[PDB]
Design a protein around this ligand. Structure first.
Ligand SMILES: Nc1ncnc2c1ncn2[C@@H]1O[C@H](COP(=O)(O)OP(=O)(O)OP(O)(O)=S)[C@@H](O)[C@H]1O
Ligand SMILES: [Mg+2]
Lengths: 164, 147
């Protein structure tokens, strides 16, 4: 499944190169290689110098805001109200996100301190996120949690894996 | 203002996303009830079934409110000005689709007597074809309107 869908996504991103506006901005997706050996095993390409989105975000949240909730406390608080009416779920979610502030803007201030490089890499991140958002809406792509999104800390641009 | 609001509510009813959501929740209710019947584990299965029922009640109540506002505002827009007069054809289709839902018939009963009958005069092929003697509320409104 993952190999077939990686091939389909690569073909559509290749279609994107034929138009002036998306080719001028190098809009496309980053690929990896899946190789199924049997019906129970495979070789997956370990993308070179990335870091999973969740593995950056969970330490950073407590490094930059030591008075906020932990990632595990937020997860548990949201999972306890999973069998309740929508009103209570939304109230619990607002209560949790009022004590959890985003810290992603630092990923670029701490891997790229040079302003020229910082600007270029933040633009790479935004463009690759936009391209994969539209391309994964059109193909119904799901299972987009933090462990399927890798941050490339050499070029700035996100990689989506596990596309099945 | 009334035509604006009625077209908005109508557009919210016939929404492909909302209809897909209602269909998905309906298939979920059906499948979960079939699973519960297969069993009669049971506690959590029933709890999930009840949560599905609560979600479905919420969705259906939203749609019922939209239907009320749609019909009421169509009737008020017909009674106010002559700019929008194909609202009579749309109101008629919308009301003949919901001839059984007593909500629609209560709203129509409340607001139908203020529309000039010259708005419905050209729709007598469609009105006189639905006439019956059934003693319901739909027929007591339809016969009075044709009269
Ligand atoms: N092809 C890959 N290249 C680079 N990193 C990867 C790749 N596949 C997985 N990873 C990361 O390395 C770890 C391996 O994850 P796995 O344990 O194989 O699956 P998983 O997604 O963590 O488990 P779940 O079901 O999502 S909780 C995760 O932290 C991933 O973010
Ligand atoms: Mg994975």
């Amino acid at each position: 499944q993952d190999a077939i869908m990686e091939q389909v996504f690569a073909a559509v991103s290749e279609l994107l190169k034929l138009h002036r506006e998306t080719r001028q901005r190098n809009l496309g997706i980053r690929t990896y290689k899946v190789l199924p050996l049997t019906s129970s095993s495979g070789l997956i390409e370990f993308v070179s110098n990335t870091i999973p989105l969740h593995e950056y975000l969970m330490p950073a949240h407590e490094r930059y805001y030591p008075k906020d909730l932990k990632g595990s406390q937020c997860r548990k608080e949201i999972a306890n109200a999973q069998t309740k009416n929508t009103e209570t779920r939304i109230a619990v979610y607002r209560r949790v996100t009022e004590r959890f502030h985003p810290v992603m803007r630092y990923f670029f201030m701490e891997y790229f301190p040079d302003p020229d490089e910082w600007f270029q890499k933040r633009t790479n991140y935004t463009r690759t996120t936009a391209a994969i958002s539209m391309l994964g809406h059109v193909l119904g792509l799901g299972d987009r949690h933090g462990h399927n999104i890798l941050l490339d800390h050499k070029t700035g641009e996100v990689v989506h894996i596990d596309l099945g | 203002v009334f035509h604006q609001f009625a077209v908005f509510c109508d557009e919210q009813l016939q929404n492909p996303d909302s209809l897909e959501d209602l269909a998905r929740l309906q298939n979920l209710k059906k499948g979960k009830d079939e699973e519960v019947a297969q069993l009669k584990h049971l506690a959590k299965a029933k709890q999930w079934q009840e949560l599905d029922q609560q979600e479905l009640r919420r969705v259906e109540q939203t749609r019922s409110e939209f239907l009320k506002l749609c019909i009421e505002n169509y009737l008020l827009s017909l009674a106010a000005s002559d700019e929008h007069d194909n609202d009579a054809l749309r109101f008629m289709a919308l009301w003949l689709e919901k001839s059984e839902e007593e909500v629609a018939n209560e709203v129509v009963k409340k607001w139908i007597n203020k529309v000039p009958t010259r708005k419905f005069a050209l729709l007598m092929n469609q009105l006189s074809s639905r006439l019956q003697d059934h003693n319901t509320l739909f027929q007591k409104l339809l016969i009075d309107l044709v009269y």
